């Protein structure tokens, strides 16, 4: 946890975060951050190992307005699991189809709301065989994730905000 805070720069910070996520049994992560009052989602600060094709397509298609995890983040400080039922609109249906093709089926997103108005998300995706297995897994590590997201946010904003 405290290693995040000590890491000099983005690159080593990112590596620490990815490894910590890997330890817990997640295969993909995204840490994404925007400053206060900003809605420039396509130029957010992004770290992690999401597929670059997904990231580019997402930004090009403006999926930040479509991704149900992102609207949720703008509205809440509580985690959102990537349950089928968060994908409610036709476009979110297609979003899910496309996210699945990129390996992003099971996971959750922890909203980030930093001390200086930063808005963001920390998503963790797990490769699982079914929704029963995935959810039960995420539920096991959730208290750890909960502390992790705020440490990530404070240190991560700290390399971004300054």
Q: Does 108 bind ligand 3M5 (CB under 6 A)?
A: no
- Interacting residues with ligand 3M5 between 12 and 71 (CB under 6 A): 30, 32-34, 41, 44, 58, 64, 67, 69-70
Nearest alpha carbon to residue 18 among 7, 27, 10, 8: 27
Question: Quick one: which of 22, 38, 74, 88 contacts a second copy (CB under 8 A)?
Answer: 74
- Interacting residues with a second copy between 118 and 157 (CB under 8 A): 142-144, 146-147, 150-151, 153-154
Comparing CB distances to a second copy, the nearer of 70 and 104 is 70
- If contact means CB under 5 to 8 A according to the sort of partner, which of ligand 3M5, a second copy, none does residue 134 touch? none
Long-range own/partner contacts, residues 75-81 (CB < 8 A, 24 or more apart): 76/111, 77/111, 77/113, 78/111, 79/108, 79/109, 79/110, 79/111, 79/142, 79/145, 79/146, 80/108, 80/109, 80/111, 81/107, 81/108, 81/135, 81/138
Per CB under 8 A, residues contacting a second copy are: 36, 73-78, 111, 113-117, 142-144, 146-147, 150-151, 153-154
């Amino acid at each position: 946890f405290l290693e995040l805070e000590r890491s000099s720069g983005k690159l080593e910070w990112s590596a620490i975060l990815q490894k910590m996520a890997s330890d817990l049994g997640f295969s993909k992560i995204l840490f994404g951050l925007l400053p206060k009052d900003s809605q420039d989602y396509e130029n957010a600060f992004i770290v992690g190992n999401y597929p670059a094709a997904w990231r580019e397509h997402y930004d090009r298609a403006g999926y930040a307005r479509v991704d149900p995890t992102v609207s949720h983040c703008t509205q809440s400080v509580l985690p959102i699991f990537w349950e089928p039922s968060i994908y409610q609109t036709r476009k979110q249906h297609e979003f899910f189809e496309e996210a699945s093709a990129a390996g992003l089926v099971y996971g959750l997103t922890m909203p980030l709301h930093g001390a200086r108005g930063e808005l963001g998300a920390l998503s963790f995706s797990v490769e699982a065989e079914n929704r029963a297995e995935a959810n039960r897994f995420m539920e096991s590590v959730l208290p750890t994730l909960w502390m992790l997201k705020d440490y990530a946010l404070q240190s991560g904003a700290g390399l971004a905000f300054e």
